[PDB]
Protein backbone atom coordinates (compact mmCIF):
# COMPACT_ATOMS: atom_id res chain seq x y z
CA UNK A 1 0.00 0.00 0.00
CA UNK A 2 1.78 3.13 -1.27
CA UNK A 3 1.20 6.43 0.54
CA UNK A 4 2.11 9.73 -1.11
CA UNK A 5 3.28 12.52 1.17
CA UNK A 6 4.33 16.13 1.52
CA UNK A 7 6.78 16.54 4.42
CA UNK A 8 6.61 20.23 5.29
CA UNK A 9 8.69 22.57 7.46
CA UNK A 10 8.73 26.35 7.19
CA UNK A 11 8.96 26.97 3.42
CA UNK A 12 10.31 23.47 2.57
CA UNK A 13 8.06 20.78 1.10
CA UNK A 14 9.44 17.31 0.36
CA UNK A 15 7.36 15.21 -2.04
CA UNK A 16 8.06 11.56 -1.30
CA UNK A 17 6.28 8.26 -0.95
CA UNK A 18 6.37 5.28 1.39
CA UNK A 19 4.22 2.32 2.42
CA UNK A 20 1.49 2.02 5.02
CA UNK A 21 3.86 -0.51 6.63
CA UNK A 22 6.73 2.02 6.70
CA UNK A 23 7.64 3.24 10.18
CA UNK A 24 7.80 6.88 11.24
CA UNK A 25 11.51 6.28 11.81
CA UNK A 26 12.00 5.14 8.21
CA UNK A 27 10.35 8.39 7.13
CA UNK A 28 12.85 10.28 9.30
CA UNK A 29 15.61 8.38 7.48
CA UNK A 30 14.27 9.66 4.14
CA UNK A 31 14.29 13.20 5.55
CA UNK A 32 17.83 12.67 6.87
CA UNK A 33 19.14 11.78 3.43
CA UNK A 34 17.57 14.91 1.93
CA UNK A 35 17.96 17.58 4.63
CA UNK A 36 21.00 16.12 6.47
CA UNK A 37 19.59 16.08 9.99
CA UNK A 38 19.52 12.75 11.88
CA UNK A 39 16.23 11.18 12.99
CA UNK A 40 16.82 12.11 16.64
CA UNK A 41 16.82 15.79 15.55
CA UNK A 42 13.41 15.40 13.87
CA UNK A 43 9.82 15.42 15.08
CA UNK A 44 7.11 14.36 12.62
CA UNK A 45 3.46 15.33 12.97
CA UNK A 46 0.10 14.42 11.54
CA UNK A 47 -1.87 17.65 12.07
CA UNK A 48 -0.82 18.62 15.63
CA UNK A 49 -0.16 15.04 16.79
CA UNK A 50 3.44 13.98 17.40
CA UNK A 51 4.20 10.66 15.69
CA UNK A 52 6.12 7.96 17.55
CA UNK A 53 9.17 6.52 15.75
CA UNK A 54 7.99 2.94 16.08
CA UNK A 55 4.50 3.28 14.63
CA UNK A 56 3.73 2.51 11.01
CA UNK A 57 2.37 5.25 8.78
CA UNK A 58 -0.88 3.30 8.58
CA UNK A 59 -0.97 3.07 12.38
CA UNK A 60 -0.64 6.88 12.35
CA UNK A 61 -3.58 7.16 9.94
CA UNK A 62 -1.82 7.63 6.57
CA UNK A 63 -3.73 5.37 4.18
CA UNK A 64 -3.41 4.76 0.45
CA UNK A 65 -6.83 6.31 -0.20
CA UNK A 66 -6.12 9.49 1.78
CA UNK A 67 -2.49 9.91 0.66
CA UNK A 68 -2.78 9.72 -3.16
CA UNK A 69 -0.26 10.91 -5.81
CA UNK A 70 -2.61 13.64 -6.97
CA UNK A 71 -3.54 14.58 -3.36
CA UNK A 72 -0.68 13.70 -1.00
CA UNK A 73 -1.07 13.78 2.76
CA UNK A 74 0.91 16.31 4.79
CA UNK A 75 3.47 15.34 7.42
CA UNK A 76 4.70 18.19 9.58
CA UNK A 77 8.41 18.34 10.39
CA UNK A 78 10.23 20.19 13.16
CA UNK A 79 13.97 20.22 13.78
CA UNK A 80 16.12 20.39 16.87
CA UNK A 81 16.91 23.91 18.04
CA UNK A 82 19.77 23.84 20.60
CA UNK A 83 18.63 21.66 23.54
CA UNK A 84 14.97 21.42 22.48
CA UNK A 85 12.84 21.27 19.35
CA UNK A 86 11.52 24.21 17.43
CA UNK A 87 7.75 24.54 17.42
CA UNK A 88 6.06 23.06 14.37
CA UNK A 89 5.69 25.81 11.79
CA UNK A 90 4.50 25.28 8.20
CA UNK A 91 4.16 28.32 6.07
CA UNK A 92 1.08 28.41 3.79
CA UNK A 93 1.39 28.48 0.04
CA UNK A 94 0.56 31.73 -1.70
CA UNK A 95 -3.05 32.85 -2.22
CA UNK A 96 -4.60 32.52 -5.69
CA UNK A 97 -5.86 35.74 -7.27
CA UNK A 98 -9.55 36.49 -7.66
CA UNK A 99 -11.29 34.55 -10.42
CA UNK A 100 -12.43 36.48 -13.49
CA UNK A 101 -16.15 37.09 -13.09
CA UNK A 102 -16.79 34.99 -16.23
CA UNK A 103 -15.36 31.99 -14.39
CA UNK A 104 -17.14 32.38 -11.02
CA UNK B 1 -18.20 14.65 -49.97
CA UNK B 2 -16.92 12.88 -46.86
CA UNK B 3 -15.22 16.21 -45.97
CA UNK B 4 -11.92 14.60 -45.02
CA UNK B 5 -10.50 17.92 -43.76
CA UNK B 6 -13.31 18.12 -41.17
CA UNK B 7 -12.85 14.43 -40.30
CA UNK B 8 -9.13 14.97 -39.77
CA UNK B 9 -9.87 17.82 -37.38
CA UNK B 10 -12.44 15.67 -35.54
CA UNK B 11 -10.00 12.78 -35.24
CA UNK B 12 -7.30 15.13 -33.94
CA UNK B 13 -9.70 16.24 -31.22
CA UNK B 14 -10.48 12.60 -30.46
CA UNK B 15 -6.75 11.93 -30.09
CA UNK B 16 -6.56 14.70 -27.46
CA UNK B 17 -9.30 13.23 -25.26
CA UNK B 18 -7.23 10.54 -23.57
CA UNK B 19 -10.32 8.30 -23.61
CA UNK B 20 -10.19 7.03 -27.20
CA UNK B 21 -9.15 3.36 -27.11
CA UNK B 22 -8.59 2.82 -30.86
CA UNK B 23 -8.84 -0.86 -32.05
CA UNK B 24 -10.52 -2.13 -28.74
CA UNK B 25 -13.13 -4.86 -29.30
CA UNK B 26 -16.58 -4.94 -27.72
CA UNK B 27 -15.43 -7.79 -25.46
CA UNK B 28 -12.38 -5.86 -24.29
CA UNK B 29 -14.50 -2.78 -23.57
CA UNK B 30 -16.96 -4.89 -21.58
CA UNK B 31 -14.15 -6.22 -19.38
CA UNK B 32 -12.78 -2.70 -18.87
CA UNK B 33 -16.17 -1.24 -17.91
CA UNK B 34 -17.59 -4.24 -16.01
CA UNK B 35 -17.05 -2.77 -12.53
CA UNK B 36 -17.05 0.95 -13.36
CA UNK B 37 -19.60 3.44 -11.99
CA UNK B 38 -22.83 3.85 -13.94
CA UNK B 39 -22.25 6.15 -16.89
CA UNK B 40 -18.52 5.51 -17.19
CA UNK B 41 -17.75 5.57 -20.91
CA UNK B 42 -15.06 5.28 -23.55
CA UNK B 43 -14.94 5.63 -27.32
CA UNK B 44 -13.31 3.07 -29.62
CA UNK B 45 -13.39 1.93 -33.23
CA UNK B 46 -16.50 0.06 -34.38
CA UNK B 47 -16.28 -3.49 -35.75
CA UNK B 48 -18.96 -2.50 -38.30
CA UNK B 49 -17.87 -0.86 -41.57
CA UNK B 50 -20.98 1.36 -41.75
CA UNK B 51 -19.99 3.19 -38.55
CA UNK B 52 -16.84 5.01 -37.54
CA UNK B 53 -16.81 4.73 -33.77
CA UNK B 54 -18.57 3.09 -30.86
CA UNK B 55 -19.43 4.44 -27.43
CA UNK B 56 -19.04 1.83 -24.71
CA UNK B 57 -20.73 2.80 -21.43
CA UNK B 58 -21.55 1.13 -18.11
CA UNK B 59 -25.26 0.78 -17.39
CA UNK B 60 -26.93 -0.70 -14.33
CA UNK B 61 -27.33 -3.90 -16.36
CA UNK B 62 -23.71 -4.02 -17.53
CA UNK B 63 -21.70 -2.39 -20.31
CA UNK B 64 -23.58 -1.47 -23.47
CA UNK B 65 -22.51 -0.05 -26.81
CA UNK B 66 -23.84 2.59 -29.20
CA UNK B 67 -22.35 3.25 -32.62
CA UNK B 68 -21.58 6.65 -34.18
CA UNK B 69 -21.91 7.24 -37.91
CA UNK B 70 -20.04 9.83 -39.96
CA UNK B 71 -21.83 10.91 -43.11
CA UNK B 72 -21.61 14.07 -45.22
CA UNK B 73 -19.33 15.83 -42.77
CA UNK B 74 -21.55 15.11 -39.75
CA UNK B 75 -21.40 12.75 -36.79
CA UNK B 76 -24.61 11.29 -35.42
CA UNK B 77 -25.62 8.52 -33.08
CA UNK B 78 -26.75 5.31 -34.79
CA UNK B 79 -30.08 5.94 -36.54
CA UNK B 80 -30.95 2.31 -37.10
CA UNK B 81 -31.48 2.32 -33.32
CA UNK B 82 -32.53 5.86 -32.41
CA UNK B 83 -35.22 7.78 -34.33
CA UNK B 84 -33.23 9.58 -37.05
CA UNK B 85 -35.09 12.91 -37.17
CA UNK B 86 -34.56 13.55 -33.44
CA UNK B 87 -30.78 12.97 -33.58
CA UNK B 88 -28.56 16.03 -33.40
CA UNK B 89 -25.75 16.19 -35.98
CA UNK B 90 -22.26 17.37 -35.04
CA UNK B 91 -19.15 18.55 -36.87
CA UNK B 92 -17.06 17.10 -34.04
CA UNK B 93 -17.34 13.74 -32.31
CA UNK B 94 -15.93 15.05 -29.02
CA UNK B 95 -18.63 17.74 -29.28
CA UNK B 96 -21.18 14.96 -29.74
CA UNK B 97 -19.99 13.25 -26.56
CA UNK B 98 -19.73 16.50 -24.57
CA UNK B 99 -23.25 17.45 -25.61
CA UNK B 100 -24.75 14.21 -24.28
CA UNK B 101 -22.60 14.34 -21.11
CA UNK B 102 -23.89 17.84 -20.36
CA UNK B 103 -27.48 16.84 -21.16
CA UNK B 104 -27.22 14.00 -18.63
CA UNK B 105 -26.10 16.47 -15.93
CA UNK B 106 -29.16 18.70 -16.34
CA UNK B 107 -31.62 6.47 -23.08
CA UNK B 108 -27.88 7.11 -23.20
CA UNK B 109 -26.49 8.03 -19.78
CA UNK B 110 -22.90 9.32 -19.81
CA UNK B 111 -20.96 10.65 -16.82
CA UNK B 112 -17.17 10.27 -16.80
CA UNK B 113 -14.68 8.89 -19.33
CA UNK B 114 -12.30 6.00 -18.79
CA UNK B 115 -8.82 7.33 -19.58
CA UNK B 116 -6.21 5.24 -21.45
CA UNK B 117 -3.37 7.32 -20.00
CA UNK B 118 -2.79 10.39 -17.86
CA UNK B 119 -3.30 13.56 -19.94
CA UNK B 120 -0.81 16.41 -20.00
CA UNK B 121 -1.14 19.01 -17.27
CA UNK B 122 -1.90 21.61 -19.95
CA UNK B 123 -4.87 19.53 -21.10
CA UNK B 124 -6.14 19.02 -17.55
CA UNK B 125 -6.07 22.81 -17.07
CA UNK B 126 -7.86 23.25 -20.38
CA UNK B 127 -10.62 20.90 -19.20
CA UNK B 128 -10.92 22.80 -15.91
CA UNK B 129 -11.11 26.15 -17.69
CA UNK B 130 -13.72 24.84 -20.14
CA UNK B 131 -15.86 23.63 -17.22
CA UNK B 132 -15.82 27.22 -15.93
CA UNK B 133 -16.45 29.27 -19.08
CA UNK B 134 -16.55 29.24 -22.84
CA UNK B 135 -15.41 32.87 -23.09
CA UNK B 136 -11.80 32.10 -24.03
CA UNK B 137 -11.59 35.44 -25.82
CA UNK B 138 -11.71 37.43 -22.59
CA UNK B 139 -9.45 35.38 -20.30
CA UNK B 140 -6.23 37.02 -19.03
CA UNK B 141 -4.06 34.72 -21.15
CA UNK B 142 -1.58 35.31 -23.98
CA UNK B 143 -2.99 34.68 -27.45
CA UNK B 144 -0.87 31.53 -27.77
CA UNK B 145 -2.74 29.94 -24.88
CA UNK B 146 -6.15 31.11 -26.10
CA UNK B 147 -5.45 29.32 -29.39
CA UNK B 148 -4.58 26.20 -27.38
CA UNK B 149 -7.89 26.36 -25.52
CA UNK B 150 -9.70 26.89 -28.83
CA UNK B 151 -8.27 23.59 -30.14
CA UNK B 152 -10.31 21.64 -27.55
CA UNK B 153 -13.25 23.52 -26.10
CA UNK B 154 -14.97 20.50 -24.51
CA UNK B 155 -15.67 19.88 -20.83
CA UNK B 156 -14.83 16.16 -21.01
CA UNK C 1 20.93 12.49 -8.60
CA UNK C 2 17.97 11.45 -6.45
CA UNK C 3 16.08 14.68 -5.60
CA UNK C 4 16.00 18.19 -7.10
CA UNK C 5 14.86 21.47 -5.53
CA UNK C 6 12.26 23.58 -7.37
CA UNK C 7 11.83 27.06 -5.88
CA UNK C 8 8.70 29.15 -6.38
CA UNK C 9 8.59 32.89 -6.97
CA UNK C 10 7.58 33.43 -3.35
CA UNK C 11 10.46 31.31 -2.08
CA UNK C 12 8.85 27.95 -1.30
CA UNK C 13 11.31 25.11 -1.89
CA UNK C 14 9.81 21.90 -3.34
CA UNK C 15 12.13 18.92 -3.13
CA UNK C 16 11.01 16.25 -5.58
CA UNK C 17 12.42 13.07 -7.05
CA UNK C 18 14.62 13.93 -10.02
CA UNK C 19 12.91 11.19 -12.06
CA UNK C 20 9.54 12.82 -11.34
CA UNK C 21 10.69 16.35 -12.17
CA UNK C 22 11.85 15.10 -15.60
CA UNK C 23 8.14 14.84 -16.43
CA UNK C 24 8.81 18.48 -17.39
CA UNK C 25 10.72 18.75 -20.66
CA UNK C 26 11.72 22.25 -19.57
CA UNK C 27 13.20 20.98 -16.29
CA UNK C 28 14.59 18.00 -18.23
CA UNK C 29 16.41 20.42 -20.55
CA UNK C 30 18.11 22.10 -17.61
CA UNK C 31 20.36 20.54 -8.38
CA UNK C 32 18.11 23.57 -7.91
CA UNK C 33 15.81 25.57 -10.20
CA UNK C 34 14.27 28.95 -9.44
CA UNK C 35 10.93 29.76 -11.06
CA UNK C 36 10.78 33.54 -10.93
CA UNK C 37 7.17 33.65 -12.20
CA UNK C 38 5.47 30.55 -10.72
CA UNK C 39 4.04 31.03 -7.20
CA UNK C 40 3.82 28.25 -4.65
CA UNK C 41 0.05 27.72 -4.98
CA UNK C 42 0.85 26.75 -8.57
CA UNK C 43 4.20 25.01 -8.19
CA UNK C 44 2.90 22.72 -5.42
CA UNK C 45 0.16 21.48 -7.78
CA UNK C 46 2.74 20.98 -10.56
CA UNK C 47 4.70 18.73 -8.20
CA UNK C 48 1.58 16.67 -7.49
CA UNK C 49 1.05 16.40 -11.24
CA UNK C 50 4.58 14.94 -11.56
CA UNK C 51 3.75 12.25 -8.97
CA UNK C 52 0.43 11.47 -10.64
CA UNK C 53 1.90 11.39 -14.15
CA UNK C 54 4.68 8.97 -13.18
CA UNK C 55 2.28 6.74 -11.24
CA UNK C 56 -0.40 6.64 -13.96
CA UNK C 57 1.71 6.31 -17.11
CA UNK C 58 1.85 2.73 -18.45
CA UNK C 59 -0.13 1.35 -15.54
CA UNK C 60 -3.03 -1.08 -15.46
CA UNK C 61 -4.61 0.95 -12.65
CA UNK C 62 -7.70 2.99 -13.52
CA UNK C 63 -6.63 6.61 -13.88
CA UNK C 64 -8.21 8.84 -11.20
CA UNK C 65 -9.26 12.45 -11.60
CA UNK C 66 -6.57 15.09 -11.14
CA UNK C 67 -8.13 17.88 -9.04
CA UNK C 68 -7.59 21.48 -10.19
CA UNK C 69 -9.32 24.36 -8.42
CA UNK C 70 -10.78 26.94 -10.85
CA UNK C 71 -8.86 29.67 -8.98
CA UNK C 72 -5.44 28.19 -9.92
CA UNK C 73 -6.29 26.91 -13.42
CA UNK C 74 -5.16 29.90 -15.50
CA UNK C 75 -1.77 30.26 -13.82
CA UNK C 76 -1.38 26.47 -13.78
CA UNK C 77 -2.04 26.39 -17.53
CA UNK C 78 0.70 28.97 -18.06
CA UNK C 79 3.05 27.05 -15.76
CA UNK C 80 2.33 23.75 -17.52
CA UNK C 81 2.93 25.33 -20.93
CA UNK C 82 6.20 26.91 -19.80
CA UNK C 83 7.22 23.56 -18.25
CA UNK C 84 6.13 21.48 -21.28
CA UNK C 85 4.10 18.98 -19.28
C1 LIG D 1 -30.39 6.30 -29.25
C2 LIG D 1 -29.79 5.50 -28.09
O1 LIG D 1 -29.63 6.02 -26.98
N1 LIG D 1 -29.51 4.23 -28.43
C3 LIG D 1 -28.93 3.30 -27.64
C4 LIG D 1 -28.25 3.53 -26.45
C5 LIG D 1 -27.65 2.48 -25.75
C6 LIG D 1 -27.72 1.17 -26.23
C7 LIG D 1 -28.40 0.94 -27.43
C8 LIG D 1 -28.55 -0.46 -28.04
N2 LIG D 1 -27.25 -1.10 -28.15
C9 LIG D 1 -27.14 -2.33 -28.66
O2 LIG D 1 -28.09 -3.01 -29.05
C10 LIG D 1 -25.72 -2.85 -28.74
C11 LIG D 1 -25.31 -3.10 -30.20
C12 LIG D 1 -23.79 -3.03 -30.37
C13 LIG D 1 -22.99 -4.13 -30.09
C14 LIG D 1 -21.60 -4.05 -30.25
C15 LIG D 1 -21.01 -2.88 -30.72
O3 LIG D 1 -19.65 -2.82 -30.85
P1 LIG D 1 -19.00 -2.77 -32.35
O4 LIG D 1 -19.56 -3.91 -33.16
O5 LIG D 1 -17.46 -2.87 -32.07
O6 LIG D 1 -19.47 -1.36 -32.95
C16 LIG D 1 -21.81 -1.79 -31.02
C17 LIG D 1 -23.20 -1.85 -30.83
N3 LIG D 1 -25.69 -4.08 -27.94
C18 LIG D 1 -24.88 -4.18 -26.90
O7 LIG D 1 -24.09 -3.31 -26.54
C19 LIG D 1 -24.98 -5.52 -26.17
C20 LIG D 1 -23.60 -6.00 -25.77
C21 LIG D 1 -23.07 -5.60 -24.56
C22 LIG D 1 -21.80 -6.04 -24.19
C23 LIG D 1 -21.09 -6.86 -25.05
F1 LIG D 1 -19.84 -7.30 -24.69
C24 LIG D 1 -21.62 -7.27 -26.26
C25 LIG D 1 -22.88 -6.83 -26.63
C26 LIG D 1 -28.98 1.99 -28.11
Numbering used by the authors:
A (entry chain B): 1 to 104
B (entry chain A): 30 to 135, 149 to 198
C (entry chain C): 16 to 45, 58 to 112
Paper text:
The Src homology 2 (SH2) domain recognizes phosphotyrosine (pY) post translational modifications in partner proteins to trigger downstream signaling. Here, we use structure-based design to target the SH2 domain of the E3 ligase suppressor of cytokine signaling 2 (SOCS2). SOCS2 can tightly bind to adaptor subunits ElonginB/C and scaffold subunit Cullin 5 and RING domain protein Rbx2, to function as substrate receptor of Cullin 5 RING E3 ligase complex CRL5SOCS2. In this work, we describe the structure-guided design, using fragment-based growing, of a pY-based covalent small-molecule binder targeting the SOCS2-SH2 domain.
The observation that Cys111 could act as reactive nucleophilic residue on SOCS2 prompted us to design covalent binder 15 (hence afterward referred to as MN551), by replacing the allyl group in 14 with a more electrophilic chloroacetamido group. We chose 14 as scaffold ligand instead of 13 (hydrogen instead of fluorine at the para position) due to convenient availability of 3-(Boc-amino) benzylamine as reagent for the incorporation of the chloroacetamido group during the synthesis of MN551. The chloroacetamide moiety newly introduced in MN551 covalently modified Cys111, as confirmed by protein X-ray crystallography and mass spectrometry experiments. A co-crystal structure of SBC2 preincubated with MN551 for 2 h prior to crystallization revealed the formation of a covalent bond between the chloroacetamide group of MN551 and Cys111. The binding mode for the remaining portion of the MN551 molecule remained unchanged compared to the parental analogs. Only a 1:1 covalent SOCS2:MN551 adduct was observed using intact mass analysis by electrospray protein mass spectrometry, and no reactivity was observed with a C111S mutant, consistent with high specificity of binding and modification site. Time-dependent reaction monitored by mass spectrometry showed that MN551 covalently modified recombinant SOCS2 protein to stoichiometric occupancy within 2 h at Cys111. The reversible binding affinity of MN551 to SBC2 was determined by ITC to be Ki = 2.2 µM. To confirm that MN551 blocks binding of the natural substrates of SOCS2, we performed competition ITC experiments of GHR_pY595 peptide against SBC2 either unmodified or preincubated with equimolar amount of MN551 for 2 h at room temperature. In the presence of MN551, GHR was no longer able to bind to SBC2, nor to compete out the inhibitor, demonstrating covalent saturation of the SOCS2 binding site by MN551. Covalent modification of the reactive Cys111 residue by MN551 was confirmed by co-crystal structures, and intact ESI-MS spectra with recombinant protein and mutants.
